[PDB]
Amino acid sequence: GNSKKHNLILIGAPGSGKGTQCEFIKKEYGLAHLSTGDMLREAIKNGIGLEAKSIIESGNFVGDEIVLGLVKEKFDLGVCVNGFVLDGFPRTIPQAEGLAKILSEIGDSLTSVIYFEIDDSEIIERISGRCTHPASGRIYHVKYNPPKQPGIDDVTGEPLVWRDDDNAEAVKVRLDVFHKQTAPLVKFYEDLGILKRVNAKLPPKEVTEQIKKIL
Ligand SMILES: Nc1ncnc2c1ncn2[C@@H]1O[C@H](COP(=O)(O)OP(=O)(O)OP(=O)(O)OP(=O)(O)OP(=O)(O)OC[C@H]2O[C@@H](n3cnc4c(N)ncnc43)[C@H](O)[C@@H]2O)[C@@H](O)[C@H]1O
Numbered sequence: 001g002n003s004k005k006h007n008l009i010l011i012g013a014p015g016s017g018k019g020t021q022c023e024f025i026k027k028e029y030g031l032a033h034l035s036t037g038d039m040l041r042e043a044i045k046n047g048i049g050l051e052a053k054s055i056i057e058s059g060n061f062v063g064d065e066i067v068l069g070l071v072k073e074k075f076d077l078g079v080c081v082n083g084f085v086l087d088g089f090p091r092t093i094p095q096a097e098g099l100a101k102i103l104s105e106i107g108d109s110l111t112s113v114i115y116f117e118i119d120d121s122e123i124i125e126r127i128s129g130r131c132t133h134p135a136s137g138r139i140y141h142v143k144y145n146p147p148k149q150p151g152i153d154d155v156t157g158e159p160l161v162w163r164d165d166d167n168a169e170a171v172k173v174r175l176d177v178f179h180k181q182t183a184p185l186v187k188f189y190e191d192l193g194i195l196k197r198v199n200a201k202l203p204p205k206e207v208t209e210q211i212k213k214i215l
């Protein structure tokens with residue numbers, strides 16, 4: 001971020017609007033956005049291939065060690081020195097501990113963890129309208145956050161596309177493993193005294209204003 005550096009984690013249900021908020025956070029605060037789901041889809045599309053692909057499209061978690069490898073690689077290259085926002089990582093307690101080691105080894109620390117509160121029925125409506133620009137990871141919603149022109153990305157004009165993990169059985173998996181494995185991280189970070197909550201059910205601009213109040 002330079003003068004606007006923060007070291008931020010967003011935790012929230014699959015589908016809660018973290019990558020949408022990361023667009024303003026990257027741009028306003030100059031932070032590196034690390035979505036390990038987008039990082040995995042980029043490791044896939046460049047041919048961590050078919051087995052990771054199936055695991056993601058089933059809605060299950062990829063191995064802790066695989067994702068900790070990809071995050072550590074960003075930190076080791078210097079991508080995060082100007083601040084970062086982690087989105088979808090950590091999502092298990094071994095990943096949180098692995099991250100604490102990575103930060104301990106550089107002497108940096110977390111600024112804030114922001115927990116997006118939203119219920120599972122609204123997440124199903126958020127995912128059902130989603131489409132994505134695959135090269136950039138930008139996301140739109142056909143009802144609540146549409147592209148400016150039909151069917152295409154606002155920046156490149158390239159087509160928007162479906163995500164294969166947005167099928168009904170994987171949405172159920174994603175929500176189930178989130179409540180079992182990821183939700184415990186809210187106490188993990190409240191115990192460190194750095195967790196704040198936002199009402200992710202509100203319209204996207206109102207969620208952005210709540211986030212700005214915390215940053
Ligand atoms: N650490 C890790 N460990 C192990 N496995 C890992 C892992 N990280 C990744 N994985 C694996 O990879 C998979 C993919 O991970 P990932 O790509 O992170 O998927 P996810 O966890 O299911 O989360 P999403 O990306 O779907 O949600 P989001 O919070 O980014 O919401 P978005 O802004 O898109 O918004 C959704 C929709 O809502 C719209 N929207 C946003 N805000 C609003 C609003 N306020 N009102 C109405 N609509 C809204 C959006 O336009 C969009 O249509 C995981 O399921 C797992 O298999």
Ligand SMILES: [Mg+2]
Nearest residue numbers: 018019035037
């Ligand atoms: Mg996302």
